[PDB]
RNA sequence: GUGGUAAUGCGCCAGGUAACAAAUCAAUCCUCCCACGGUGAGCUUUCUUUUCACCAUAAUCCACCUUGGGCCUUUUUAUCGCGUUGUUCGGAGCGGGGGCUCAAGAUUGAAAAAUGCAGCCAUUGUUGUGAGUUCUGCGCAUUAAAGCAAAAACCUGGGGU
RNA sequence: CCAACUGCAGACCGUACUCAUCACCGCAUCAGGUCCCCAAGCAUAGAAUGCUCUGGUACAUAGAGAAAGGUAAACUCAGGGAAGUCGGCAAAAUAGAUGCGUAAGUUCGCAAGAAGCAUUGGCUCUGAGGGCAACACAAAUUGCCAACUCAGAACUGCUUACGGCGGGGAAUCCAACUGUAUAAUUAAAACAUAGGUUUGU
RNA sequence: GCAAAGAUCUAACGGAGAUAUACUCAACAUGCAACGUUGGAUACUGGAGCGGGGAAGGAUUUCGUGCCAACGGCACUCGUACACGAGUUGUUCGGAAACUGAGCACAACGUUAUAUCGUUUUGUUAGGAAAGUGAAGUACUGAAAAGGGGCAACAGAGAACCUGGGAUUAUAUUCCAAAAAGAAAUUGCAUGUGGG
RNA sequence: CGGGGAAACCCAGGUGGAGGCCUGUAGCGAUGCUGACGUGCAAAUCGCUCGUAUGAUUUGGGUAUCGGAGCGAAAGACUCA
């Protein structure tokens, strides 16, 4: 698992040609965007709703987005 | 244990496939004798020692 | 640890306070012998180790089937539960009613 | 094993598994690629 | 009839031993419906098996004798079996009590109450056993600061 | 009572090579896990002193 | 290939790791006890702000305070100073001021709540102190007419290519 | 040519169960024998010994039940106290901790726990033993807090009352000492030993 | 004779294993004794354990459904017994591939009427010519490097993986499927991106 | 480290933790009851009592030496009842 520290490096790895899937976190105060990829899981956390909505926003149509819930028992 | 050759387990599982009694038609078959196993062979009562 | 106890100071055991606060407990009794009770925790509510007597330090109020306990003395949550389960075992109602907390200061009364 | 499956049913393996068992044969766990329905290529089968 | 195969099965999904796992004795039928791990979860769930707590152990009379022994009760000559080094050794008073003193005697030449003349004459008496306590080093130190001041 | 734990990668004995700790996981459990061993690091020649090396 | 007065930092041949003992004193993980608090259950004729259970965090990575060793540079020490529970160290460089390194911890994050546990589509969710534990560190002085295996595999340098 | 990223691939054998008062050896599901790891609470010096939560068990043919005589990892016994017997065999007996005190002999290390005398419960108190936080010399003081041991006093009680735990003294013979040793009748004064001497080279 | 290892009691359910009767007779004096499961009670083991895992040895004794002739020195509705049907999943765990030790003894040479004998690690076989290679220049071809080939440790050396699971009747650091419950590490060979 | 001494050295208080040292578990053995048993639980076992318990110590696996031969802290002990 590795930490991106900032937008323009993490559009750089979600564009790569093996970023499988976004996963999408939400926590009681900040949000996670969670890239697959192939080798590492690629994190990047936002404290910041307002911007948590551009970013889940500005997403490309060839990777799947997923909103990470508790799934069924 | 966990450990034995695999030409011993190959041994001990012919020993267990024979292990077994005789069908009941072969003593319906004409001119027979056989009536038990007679090679049958406990794991408490007679050791293989492979 | 520090200073060696005595026995006679066991005549005087004084609770903690609240430095700057004032804590509140409920207990939802909603669900005839709403009587009985607050006073029941007034003369039964022990304050520094000495049963009833309770001064302006521990206030009760009966409101709409619940019952109130405003203090500002340092006081467990399950102490309260502990006088509910000593109250329903003298009326014989415990294989019925049940206690069981609701939320951060607040229980409730329930059926088996 | 492999090989075989992909030879004898148009289907491919993504695992193999193998074990010996104590009378002295070999059985195989196969899973397929989930492109395949292994249902329906045991229903061409017969089993 | 047998429940034994339930009995085991809610053993090993409760996480238990057999002593603990409760099988209720008019559910019997129902009970014997059961052969596998999931329809044993299924009776739990239900109801008709449950998991007791443990038995009791408690630790409340050693607390009330500890209030005592801490006041000093029970420690006298006819209740002591081992020897005193065995119930406290002198090796481990020795070590407390010089490091006691070294830490002492470290604090006043940082602070500058002490010189190195003095530090090093007193850290050697203190290894040779001059000074039976914390106190006792005190007073030495505060003889010696008069004695200078009257003759300076 | 107490956990009691069991050895897990079917060695047995306790010599230099096979050290143990112990560890409780996510799930509430103490298990055993195995310590690796660890070198002296780099030396200057016996004959010289044997020595550690700085950096 | 390239920085710093320096300790040292960053992109065929010769050594090293593997590789080895005791005691003492500290010991981490983990276990046990206690204090405070939350949740469930037990006892209640009486007494008991009570008794019992539970309160969890795996490998692998990122960034970078404490203890213990080795060393550099500046001020140059002496009968004298520095230090251990302990049998000792110093012009072949003590102490102080600033640094460089290694070992072991810590603290941030990522993983990771999406998991686990317990009451019942919702609640809970823990932080401190003692004691015991051989990892580890105290670097390689246990009796000794006793002095404590080897090699594969791997690492660095000197040379020339 | 050098990381690192990415794509594809990652062969063979072992894997159930047991490890023992029923799974192995002893003709048997035999009170014998058989290597390693994890190891809780209280008493206490404690891996002694007694009792207990977790996990485990109620399986070893039973029932009724005052003979004599037995076996026991079972007890007592007035008065006397080895008179018993080849022989104090067996049993009794001593007993923890702390203070005081301790002979001949001696290779100076011991002998020695020599021998012997005294105290010990319960309750309510008192003192001693620490940590870190705030050229000028009583910060020689203010606050907060832990963990147990030792010593002294008053009052009060005994039917001497769990377990566990040396009997002692004066002499003779032999062997210096620790050790080894007739598996299944001999553990010794026998063998070994350090030390001494001789022989061959 | 079946006497060491302290010990069982009670109700309900199950079972052919009962509450089983000729006159007469309400019931006792005419069907006894003994068993499996669940609940409750009472005790024991007492962490150097009638706890939980392994080596040697054993080899299906493991799991489920039946059955009760023989066997479990008493008994059985029960069984490690008997019948039928099932169960052991690995790039990373142990071994091997691939180390060396106390040692062994193929080749070589010697000996013996006779090899079925001896030597074979004190750096090392044998009167002894035991090396078959990279590189340069498409396999080919031919310079250097004394001391032949191999075995012997499942507790020494070596060794890239961790937790969660509502995932079994029985296996699991081995099984789980694209949200792989998931997160990693590592070897070989090829792509391309940056740098030589 | 204190005291004494002209000197040589002497007296005393601590620290430290040596030993084929002492008491005592596990382990390794086997003194006495001439106890139990003696068609046994057993072709050598059981109970209590007892020796040793940091060493010339106990123990797993591997390896090496045998039949007129081997091995022996030596009993003609032991070499699968
Ligand atoms: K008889
Ligand atoms: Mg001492
Ligand atoms: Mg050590
Ligand atoms: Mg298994
Ligand atoms: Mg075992
Ligand atoms: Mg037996
Ligand atoms: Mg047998
Ligand atoms: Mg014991
Ligand atoms: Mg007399
Ligand atoms: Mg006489
Ligand atoms: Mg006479
Ligand atoms: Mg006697
Ligand atoms: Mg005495
Ligand atoms: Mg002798
Ligand atoms: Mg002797
Ligand atoms: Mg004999
Ligand atoms: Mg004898
Ligand atoms: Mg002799
Ligand atoms: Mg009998
Ligand atoms: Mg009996
Ligand atoms: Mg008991
Ligand atoms: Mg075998
Ligand atoms: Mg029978
Ligand atoms: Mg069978
Ligand atoms: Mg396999
Ligand atoms: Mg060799
Ligand atoms: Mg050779
Ligand atoms: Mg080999
Ligand atoms: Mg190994
Ligand atoms: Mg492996
Ligand atoms: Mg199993
Ligand atoms: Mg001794
Ligand atoms: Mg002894
Ligand atoms: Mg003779
Ligand atoms: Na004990
Ligand atoms: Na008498
Ligand atoms: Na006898």
Known sequence: ?73 | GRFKPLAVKKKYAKKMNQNKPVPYWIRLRTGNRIKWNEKRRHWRRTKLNY | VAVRAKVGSRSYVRQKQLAKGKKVFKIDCSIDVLGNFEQFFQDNTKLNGRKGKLSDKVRLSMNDNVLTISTTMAYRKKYFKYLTKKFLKKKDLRDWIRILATGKGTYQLKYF | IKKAMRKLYQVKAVKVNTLIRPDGLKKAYIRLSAAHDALDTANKIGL | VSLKLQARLASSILGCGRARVWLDPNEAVEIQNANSRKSVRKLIKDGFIIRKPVKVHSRARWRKMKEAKDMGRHNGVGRREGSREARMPSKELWMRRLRILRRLLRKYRADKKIDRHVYRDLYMRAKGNVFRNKRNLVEHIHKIKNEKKKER | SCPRVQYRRRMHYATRGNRMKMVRTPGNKLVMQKRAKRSQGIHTPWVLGHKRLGG
């Open chain 1, 1 to 73: 698992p590795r930490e991106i520290k900032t937008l323009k490096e993490f559009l750089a790895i979600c564009s790569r040609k093996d970023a499988r899937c976004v996963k999408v976190k939400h926590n009681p105060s900040a949000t996670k965007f969670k890239v697959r990829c192939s080798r590492y899981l690629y994190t990047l956390v936002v404290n910041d709703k307002k911007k948590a909505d551009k970013i889940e926003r500005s997403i490309h149509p060839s990777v799947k987005k997923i909103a990470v819930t508790a799934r069924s028992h």
